[PDB]
C-alpha cells in the first residue's frame, strides 16, 4: 500500500533492468537514416546534435563520441558503462535512448529530443528558483536516485547542465557518462568539481552516498542561484568542499537549511540517504512536507515553469554552438575496444 507498493514496483523494475543489462541492445540504427540539423551541446569527445529521422520524421538528439578521443582520455570503460546502463533503464525522469550504433570513427547514442533546454540556462537567466520551484525538481531527482540506486547504479554527474526540461516542465536526466553499476565501493575521481563529495576528492573509496551529497549541492544552487562551494579553479573548490563549512543565503527557510546540513554532511554515518531509513529520511523531511511523491512520479503535479516551444525542430531553448563536419574514416578505428557497443 505505502511501502509495499514501492517495493513491488522496484522488484519488477530490477527484473526488467537485469534482462537488458545481461543482453544489451546493439546496432539499432545507422547514420544515413538521419539528417543532422544543429548542435545542441558540445563535450570533451564530441557533441549532441539535433537530428531528423528520415523514415519517421521524428526529431532526436544524437550524441556523437569520437572513438579515438575516448581511447586517448582512457574513457573506454565509462563509455561502455554509459550505453549499457542507459539502454537498460526505464523511469519517467530519465531520457530515453531510442537508438544506438557505431561506425569506423564514432559511437552514436540517439535519445529522445528534450526541447525545453538545460535547467542550467533557465537557472542562470532567472537567477534562482523559489523554494517550491526547487522542491518540484528536487523531488524528481530523489525518486530517480531511489530508482537508480535500487539497481546498484551510481549516477555521478548531477548538475543543472545534465538536467533537461521537457514540454510538460518535468526533468529529463541526461548524460550517463559516469554512471556505473557497483555493489562495493569505487574510486574514480570523476564528476563535476562543484558537485563532488569530499570522499571522492580525498581519494577515499565511495558509494551511492555521493549522489545524495550532489543532491544537496543541486538544491542549494537551484535555491541560491550559486553553488555552496565555488572559486575560479577546481583545486580551490575542493579545499572548500573538504573543509565542509557551508553558508546559506538570508532567504533560505529554516527547513531548507536543515535538509542541506543533512545532505551536505561530511560524516557518512550522518548523511541523509545513507542512514538506516535510507531515502525515507529525505522524503519525510519537513522541507518536503508539501510533496506528494506519487503525484510527482505520475507527473500529475502542475509544473511551475513551462518552456516555450515553437514546434518540432525548435532549438530556441539551447545556446548556439560552432558546427563541425562529422568525419568518418574508411578505416575502422578501435574495433576490438568497442565490440560490445
Amino acid at each position: 500500500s505505502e511501502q509495499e507498493s514501492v517495493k513491488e514496483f522496484l522488484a519488477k523494475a530490477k527484473e526488467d533492468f537485469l534482462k537488458k543489462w545481461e543482453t544489451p541492445s546493439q546496432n539499432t540504427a545507422q547514420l544515413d537514416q538521419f539528417d543532422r540539423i544543429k548542435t545542441l551541446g558540445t563535450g570533451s569527445f564530441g557533441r549532441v546534435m539535433l537530428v531528423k529521422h528520415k523514415e519517421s520524421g521524428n526529431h532526436y538528439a544524437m550524441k556523437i563520441l569520437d572513438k579515438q578521443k575516448v581511447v586517448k582520455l582512457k574513457q573506454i570503460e565509462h563509455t561502455l558503462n554509459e550505453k549499457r546502463i542507459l539502454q537498460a533503464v526505464n523511469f519517467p525522469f530519465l531520457v530515453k535512448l531510442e537508438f544506438s550504433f557505431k561506425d569506423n570513427s564514432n559511437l552514436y547514442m540517439v535519445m529522445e529530443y528534450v526541447a525545453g533546454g538545460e535547467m542550467f540556462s533557465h537557472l542562470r537567466r532567472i537567477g534562482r528558483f523559489s523554494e517550491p520551484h526547487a522542491r518540484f525538481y528536487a523531488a524528481q531527482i530523489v525518486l530517480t536516485f531511489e530508482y537508480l540506486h535500487s539497481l546498484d547504479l551510481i549516477y555521478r554527474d548531477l548538475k543543472p547542465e545534465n538536467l533537461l526540461i521537457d514540454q510538460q516542465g518535468y526533468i529529463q536526466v541526461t548524460d550517463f557518462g559516469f554512471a556505473k553499476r557497483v555493489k562495493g565501493r569505487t574510486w574514480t575521481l570523476c564528476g563535476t568539481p562543484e558537485y563532488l563529495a569530499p570522499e571522492i576528492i580525498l581519494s577515499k573509496g565511495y558509494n551511492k552516498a555521493v549522489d545524495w551529497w550532489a543532491l544537496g549541492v543541486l538544491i542549494y544552487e537551484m535555491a541560491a542561484g550559486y553553488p555552496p562551494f565555488f572559486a575560479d579553479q577546481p583545486i580551490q573548490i575542493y579545499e572548500k568542499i573538504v573543509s565542509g563549512k557551508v553558508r546559506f543565503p538570508s532567504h533560505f527557510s529554516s527547513d531548507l537549511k536543515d535538509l542541506l546540513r543533512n545532505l551536505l554532511q561530511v560524516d557518512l554515518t550522518k548523511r541523509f540517504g545513507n542512514l538506516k531509513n535510507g531515502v525515507n529520511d529525505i522524503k519525510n523531511h519537513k522541507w518536503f512536507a508539501t510533496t506528494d511523491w506519487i503525484a510527482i512520479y505520475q507527473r500529475k503535479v502542475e509544473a511551475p515553469f513551462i518552456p516555450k516551444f515553437k514546434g518540432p525542430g525548435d532549438t530556441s531553448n539551447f545556446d548556439d554552438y560552432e558546427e563541425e563536419e562529422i568525419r568518418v574514416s574508411i578505416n575502422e578505428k578501435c574495433g576490438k575496444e568497442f565490440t560490445e557497443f
Partner: peptide
C-alpha cells in the same frame, strides 16, 4: 555579496565534467 563574487568568477558558464 556572495552573488556578486560568484558572478565575477570564471565558473558561471556551463561546467565540463572531469576525469579520471
Amino acid at each position: 555579496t556572495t552573488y556578486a563574487d560568484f558572478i565575477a568568477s570564471g565558473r558561471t558558464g556551463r561546467r565540463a565534467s572531469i576525469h579520471d
